[PDB]
Design an enzyme around this catalytic site. Structure first.
Site, PDB file in Angstrom:
ATOM      1  N   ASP A  44      -8.968  -7.808  72.456  1.00  0.00           N
ATOM      2  CA  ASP A  44     -10.218  -8.546  72.653  1.00  0.00           C
ATOM      3  C   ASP A  44     -10.204  -9.542  73.812  1.00  0.00           C
ATOM      4  OD1 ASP A  44     -12.593  -9.925  72.285  1.00  0.00           O
ATOM      5  OD2 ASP A  44     -12.135 -10.631  70.296  1.00  0.00           O
ATOM      6  N   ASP A  77     -16.250  -8.660  77.611  1.00  0.00           N
ATOM      7  CA  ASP A  77     -15.831  -8.771  76.207  1.00  0.00           C
ATOM      8  C   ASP A  77     -15.515  -7.435  75.543  1.00  0.00           C
ATOM      9  OD1 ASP A  77     -15.331  -9.616  73.672  1.00  0.00           O
ATOM     10  OD2 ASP A  77     -17.414  -9.944  73.134  1.00  0.00           O
TER      11      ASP A  77
HETATM   12  C1  LIG Z   1     -13.353 -16.998  75.162  1.00  0.00           C
HETATM   13  C2  LIG Z   1     -13.545 -18.504  75.412  1.00  0.00           C
HETATM   14  C3  LIG Z   1     -13.054 -19.408  74.245  1.00  0.00           C
HETATM   15  N1  LIG Z   1     -13.528 -18.860  72.982  1.00  0.00           N
HETATM   16  C4  LIG Z   1     -14.955 -18.962  72.686  1.00  0.00           C
HETATM   17  C5  LIG Z   1     -15.331 -20.450  72.670  1.00  0.00           C
HETATM   18  C6  LIG Z   1     -14.278 -21.330  71.935  1.00  0.00           C
HETATM   19  C7  LIG Z   1     -12.593 -18.304  72.161  1.00  0.00           C
HETATM   20  O1  LIG Z   1     -11.409 -18.283  72.487  1.00  0.00           O
HETATM   21  C8  LIG Z   1     -12.992 -17.710  70.890  1.00  0.00           C
HETATM   22  C9  LIG Z   1     -12.380 -18.154  69.687  1.00  0.00           C
HETATM   23  C10 LIG Z   1     -12.739 -17.552  68.449  1.00  0.00           C
HETATM   24  C11 LIG Z   1     -12.118 -18.010  67.189  1.00  0.00           C
HETATM   25  C12 LIG Z   1     -13.701 -16.503  68.410  1.00  0.00           C
HETATM   26  C13 LIG Z   1     -14.304 -16.047  69.616  1.00  0.00           C
HETATM   27  C14 LIG Z   1     -15.298 -14.982  69.557  1.00  0.00           C
HETATM   28  O2  LIG Z   1     -16.027 -14.817  68.587  1.00  0.00           O
HETATM   29  N2  LIG Z   1     -15.346 -14.194  70.659  1.00  0.00           N
HETATM   30  C15 LIG Z   1     -16.329 -13.096  70.740  1.00  0.00           C
HETATM   31  C16 LIG Z   1     -17.020 -13.162  72.121  1.00  0.00           C
HETATM   32  C17 LIG Z   1     -17.549 -14.560  72.382  1.00  0.00           C
HETATM   33  C18 LIG Z   1     -18.479 -15.151  71.481  1.00  0.00           C
HETATM   34  C19 LIG Z   1     -18.970 -16.458  71.728  1.00  0.00           C
HETATM   35  F1  LIG Z   1     -19.836 -17.007  70.878  1.00  0.00           F
HETATM   36  C20 LIG Z   1     -18.545 -17.186  72.870  1.00  0.00           C
HETATM   37  C21 LIG Z   1     -17.619 -16.598  73.771  1.00  0.00           C
HETATM   38  F2  LIG Z   1     -17.217 -17.273  74.840  1.00  0.00           F
HETATM   39  C22 LIG Z   1     -17.118 -15.287  73.526  1.00  0.00           C
HETATM   40  C23 LIG Z   1     -15.692 -11.701  70.509  1.00  0.00           C
HETATM   41  O3  LIG Z   1     -16.692 -10.675  70.689  1.00  0.00           O
HETATM   42  C24 LIG Z   1     -15.137 -11.546  69.099  1.00  0.00           C
HETATM   43  C25 LIG Z   1     -16.254 -11.703  68.045  1.00  0.00           C
HETATM   44  C26 LIG Z   1     -15.793 -11.314  66.653  1.00  0.00           C
HETATM   45  O4  LIG Z   1     -16.935 -11.360  65.807  1.00  0.00           O
HETATM   46  C27 LIG Z   1     -16.589 -11.050  64.469  1.00  0.00           C
HETATM   47  C28 LIG Z   1     -17.784 -11.427  63.589  1.00  0.00           C
HETATM   48  C29 LIG Z   1     -15.167  -9.922  66.662  1.00  0.00           C
HETATM   49  C30 LIG Z   1     -14.021  -9.848  67.660  1.00  0.00           C
HETATM   50  N3  LIG Z   1     -14.519 -10.208  69.016  1.00  0.00           N
HETATM   51  C31 LIG Z   1     -13.954 -16.648  70.856  1.00  0.00           C
END
Ligand SMILES: CCCN(CCC)C(=O)c1cc(C)cc(C(=O)N[C@@H](Cc2cc(F)cc(F)c2)[C@H](O)[C@H]2C[C@@H](OCC)CCN2)c1
Length: 390
Positions: free
Chosen positions: A232, A36
């Site tokens: 990201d 990530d």
């Molecule tokens: C990747 C697999 C599919 N998936 C997660 C499940 C639907 C996404 O596409 C997705 C969509 C959205 C809208 C946000 C984030 C997200 O928050 N991703 C974060 C990592 C992550 C979290 C999670 F809790 C499950 C997961 F697997 C992966 C990043 O660090 C993201 C967080 C964000 O936080 C801001 C508060 C800053 C930018 N990077 C991930």
């Protein structure tokens, strides 16, 4: 290609994340870890969870050190709570080094773990500024660099298959490469073009122009980076600021107007299907993002195909149709260049030189008529004004 030991060390897919094998503790406990670049905490499931078939067992590690501190990490998607500590960590298909790193042992979580993803933890590769609880909790890559001779650089080749991978196929398939400490030339074609990392927190970049099939989206470039633009790997989609999303969807609809798609498709929630092999790639436009270059007044562009922004999904009827979801969505927190965009390119996170490089990926999906591209240079003025200031 000079990093053969690290080539092909990733597994996964854009919709569930790409992961690398790691070991934690003594004796080593093997765990799959989500790569990530959008966060900065290294954390692993450390208690039973319905979606985990394995987890970090602190009591079995002779090298476990308890920091006696809790940690809460909220992501856009979900969140987890855990207990901080340190332990010895290695990457089997990585640099032959072992480092002592901070590890958040996850004890509670909500909408974090994904059923069937095959990963049990997360490797936040971004900077300490966004680490939880605060910037004093040294991120894994910072520890790696400080404790070893590994160059302060890593590169990612995320490989989308271009079609659905069932449960067994995604477990046996190579999903890409994470080269730790270097650049492997077998992973890309053409030249590497670099954009400055604007500030070391997220991997923040500046987009200076957007085109849909060569047509300028024609927005004040500050809108493209409102309130930031980041690279990201932990987000599936290309996420765009509300106004930019609205403009891009209008333009992509106009370019693809020979076929009408339901509103649910454009909302990224509903799949669209075509008879096997008949996906009309040519009616969909290419999308070009121009990025600030390292030379004053110079930019370059990365061009993606619908084979990147249309994500392969299995038909709810498991038939033989080729089906996809629109992998471009709206954001209220800036542009997010997610995995579907990264799948078109080999991306170099050159921390040492504060820059991100892009080159056409040797594993990007394309057709006989079009390919992804990274091209430059272009004369571009006042690019600093494209950056947003709160
Ligand atoms: C990747 C697999 C599919 N998936 C997660 C499940 C639907 C996404 O596409 C997705 C969509 C959205 C809208 C946000 C984030 C997200 O928050 N991703 C974060 C990592 C992550 C979290 C999670 F809790 C499950 C997961 F697997 C992966 C990043 O660090 C993201 C967080 C964000 O936080 C801001 C508060 C800053 C930018 N990077 C991930």
């Amino acid at each position: 290609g000079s990093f053969v030991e690290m080539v092909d060390n990733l597994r996964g897919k854009s919709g569930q994340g790409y992961y690398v094998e790691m070991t934690v503790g003594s004796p080593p406990q093997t765990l799959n870890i989500l790569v990530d670049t959008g966060s900065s905490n290294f954390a692993v499931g450390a208690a039973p969870h319905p979606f985990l078939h394995r987890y970090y067992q602190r009591q079995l590690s002779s090298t476990y050190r308890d920091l006696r501190k809790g940690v809460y990490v909220p992501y856009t998607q979900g969140k987890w709570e855990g207990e901080l500590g340190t332990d010895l960590v290695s990457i089997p298909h990585g640099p032959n080094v072992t480092v002592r790193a901070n590890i958040a042992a996850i004890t509670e979580s909500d909408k974090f773990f994904i059923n069937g993803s095959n990963w049990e933890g997360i490797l936040g590769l971004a900077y300490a500024e966004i680490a939880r609880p605060d910037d004093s909790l040294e991120p894994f890559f910072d520890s790696l660099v400080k404790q070893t001779h590994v160059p302060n650089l890593f590169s990612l080749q995320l490989c989308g298959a271009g079609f659905p991978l069932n449960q067994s196929e995604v477990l046996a398939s190579v999903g890409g490469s994470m080269i730790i400490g270097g650049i492997d030339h077998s992973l890309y074609t053409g030249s590497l073009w670099y954009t400055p990392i604007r500030r070391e927190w997220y991997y923040e970049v500046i987009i200076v122009r957007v085109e849909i099939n060569g047509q300028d989206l024609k927005m004040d470039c500050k809108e493209y980076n409102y309130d930031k633009s980041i690279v990201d790997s932990g987000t599936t989609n290309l996420r765009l600021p509300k106004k930019v999303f609205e403009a891009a969807v209008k333009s992509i609809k106009a370019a693809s107007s020979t076929e009408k798609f339901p509103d649910g498709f454009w909302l990224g929630e509903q799949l669209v299907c075509w008879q096997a092999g008949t996906t009309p790639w040519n009616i969909f436009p290419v999308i070009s993002l121009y990025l600030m270059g390292e030379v004053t007044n110079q930019s370059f562009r990365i061009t993606i195909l619908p084979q990147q922004y249309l994500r392969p999904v299995e038909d709810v009827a498991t038939s033989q149709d080729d089906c996809y979801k629109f992998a471009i969505s709206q954001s209220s927190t800036g542009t997010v260049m997610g995995a579907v965009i990264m799948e078109g390119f080999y991306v170099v996170f050159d921390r040492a030189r504060k820059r991100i490089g892009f080159a056409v990926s040797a594993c990007h999906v394309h057709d006989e008529f079009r390919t992804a591209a990274v091209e430059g240079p272009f004369v571009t003025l006042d690019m600093e004004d494209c950056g947003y200031n709160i």
